[PDB]
Amino acid sequence: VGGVWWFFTLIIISSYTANLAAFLTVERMVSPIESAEDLSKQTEIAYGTLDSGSTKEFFRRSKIAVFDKMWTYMRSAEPSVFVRTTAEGVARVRKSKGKYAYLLESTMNEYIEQRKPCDTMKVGGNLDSKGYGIATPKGSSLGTPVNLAVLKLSEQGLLDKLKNKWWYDKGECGAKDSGSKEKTSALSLSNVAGVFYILVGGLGLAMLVALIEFCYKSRAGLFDRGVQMLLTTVGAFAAFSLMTIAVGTDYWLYSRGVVMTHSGLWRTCCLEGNFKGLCKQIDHFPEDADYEADTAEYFLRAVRASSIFPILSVILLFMG
Amino acid sequence: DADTKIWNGMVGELVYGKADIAIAPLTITLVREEVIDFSKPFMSLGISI
Amino acid sequence: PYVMMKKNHEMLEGNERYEGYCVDLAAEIAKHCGFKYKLTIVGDGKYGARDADTKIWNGMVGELVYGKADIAIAPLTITLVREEVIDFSKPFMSLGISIMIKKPQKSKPGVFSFLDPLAYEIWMCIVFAYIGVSVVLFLVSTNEFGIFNSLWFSLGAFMQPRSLSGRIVGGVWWFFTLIIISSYTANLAAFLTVERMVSPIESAEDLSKQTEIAYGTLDSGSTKEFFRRSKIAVFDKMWTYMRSAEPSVFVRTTAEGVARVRKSKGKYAYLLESTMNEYIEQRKPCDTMKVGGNLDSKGYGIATPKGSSLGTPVNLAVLKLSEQGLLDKLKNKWWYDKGECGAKDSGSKEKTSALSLSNVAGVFY
Amino acid sequence: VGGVWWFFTLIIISSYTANLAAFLTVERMVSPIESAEDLSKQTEIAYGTL
Ligand SMILES: O=c1[nH]c2cc(C(F)(F)F)c(N3CCOCC3)cc2n(CP(=O)(O)O)c1=O
Ligand SMILES: O=c1[nH]c2cc(C(F)(F)F)c(N3CCOCC3)cc2n(CP(=O)(O)O)c1=O
Questions:
Q1: Residue nearest atom 9 of ligand 2, based on CA coordinates
Q2: Sign of the dihedral through C-alpha C284, C285, C286, C291
Q3: CB-based contact C193:A23 (threshold 8 Å)
Q4: Which sites bind L-glutamate (chain B)?
Q5: What distance in angstroms lies between residue C74's CA and the mean position of ligand 2's atoms?
């Protein structure tokens, strides 16, 4: 008994260990994206652009390898991966739990990242090289002057300064970026903690049995011997009776499918809208489920045989 | 607009003498460089994720 | 990889002698502007500077102002000092200053590979509960009699009649340690399967916040002069460090800088133009990588003599090429396609396995 | 001594078990070429034509 029980617990603890490893192995397998090529190599995470604009027209006309496949996907992706406005796109990313990515201008993106609730971030480098500029009527007097002015401002780092002023400084967040640093990246104390509480709980239970034990010793049971036999007999009888009640519980399983189905070993029932319930008295249940499951005969019904035997054994035991 | 062949927005107000200069996040595109003049980029960008 | 001498350049002549990004960019510009051309290498081999004394322009920018050439197709930076003497088309390639570090390698046992799977916080609590049980058992069983017992319960602690009280304590404590050792084993297996080795963090701000990893730039150039004149918070501190860092954090040439990064085991970072950096990353032994975004916004352009006929045409040509994605295509051709290294391919390579001694050693000590 | 030696062997046998699990996990990770697309997705195995 001690040997078989040992072999039993050996298998279980081995199973627990092995199983716990797959959940940790896969937990590491997870690799967030980072580049555009990552969006094409996978399909789990949907993605799209604005329904109208240079962004969408870019992929459509792009003859580049990666961007080509991306467009092919978005072109026939269902439901529509394209949004009406930029606000809708951001909202879709914030409500998809990371299942939807949105492609937009880096400038507007970087700004969004610095806005509450600070739940969005730009990943990887840009897909193409663009640039804004000061526009002046063809053949204007301000033409050359403004041109040089822009170059002068950039070299004085005044342009970079301005951007920092309205994008990062103006924030704000300014907090959601310091937490996005991506420091942590290991296991944790959480799971292990649950095992610590059950330990202290066991220690406390023992500290209670110690005092209790002492008290008992001091006291020193004979009363129970007389009324203990009667007590134990009626407890056994009560347990047996309830076991029989449990087996017949017109509810061994409920298979919701909104109707409502509940079954035991004898009846399969259904509650229709609204409230009316009907039952198909069949009595126990081996049927044509092609189960087998590879031997011959025994179940369904096998549970019937074990329950009936249990009650017969309990009756013989109660009597004796 | 392909049909009317009319420019709209800021680029429009420049070609039709409504304004003297356009200071905004105006993208430097070939289609625009033909009708107006673009100073050197004051901010380089692109498409992101 | 803008303009290089072809393999059998000795058996070739004219424009066929050269190959590269700009060599292809030249043919493209010439096709959209409609003209024949003759690729020529600048004499002094410089870009475009202006000697303060003689007030003379040198390099390509020079050959343009003095009528030696009709157009300049090269990685010529668009600067204010040059825009005054010549004409720059719109940028055909935006760039900036980037950071270069060693190859995200990995290796180190320090019995600290055993405390990692199991967090330092967890090793602590498992020790607190350890003495927390040896003290509870100690209360189950005059001053020395308590010492001999505390040493006996500490031996009942150092792990391996029917006093129900302390009995369930030994059982629960056993179930507790069972879960932990099972967790350690499972977690360590995950580690031995994936085995991913990260690295530092991309952010010039990261170079200023720390000192363990030295860093510098070229002893002479716009890169160095950038930090010196930069009034930006982060870049300011960086310059202050490099300005008085000993030994010299500045290198003579770009090759020396790269060599310093490859021979410092990740203790030295080199700051250089993103363009040249990205290219280096695609060269054997593939032990360098660019981290974080650029520090500033620059851009190369096609230079043409002030008030030239090719002025407007070339300008539009550059814009046309970029919109057709031809520029991006060319870069991919010479940087990544023609490359030799690989990053997204090294992570896509699912293969590896072997036990060492490092981790196990920590448990021996 | 018996306690520390026990903790020592505990770590080792745990390491052996974990590592051995990895040698079988990776052994399954390995996939063989099934189609042409497999030749393009990898580089370890060179290939060419006439
Ligand atoms: O010259 C142009 N400059 C633009 C500048 C910006 C912004 F980044 F917000 F400054 C934007 N947005 C990006 C995000 O979605 C909301 C608006 C659109 C621009 N468009 C329209 P396109 O035809 O879609 O490129 C232009 O034409
Ligand atoms: O017009 C210019 N174009 C340049 C183009 C390049 C390259 F990227 F290699 F094409 C470089 N390098 C970057 C890496 O270090 C080695 C040479 C320097 C350039 N410089 C000198 P700066 O004064 O330091 O900017 C110019 O003046």
A1: C276
A2: negative
A3: no
A4: 25, 27, 32
A5: 10
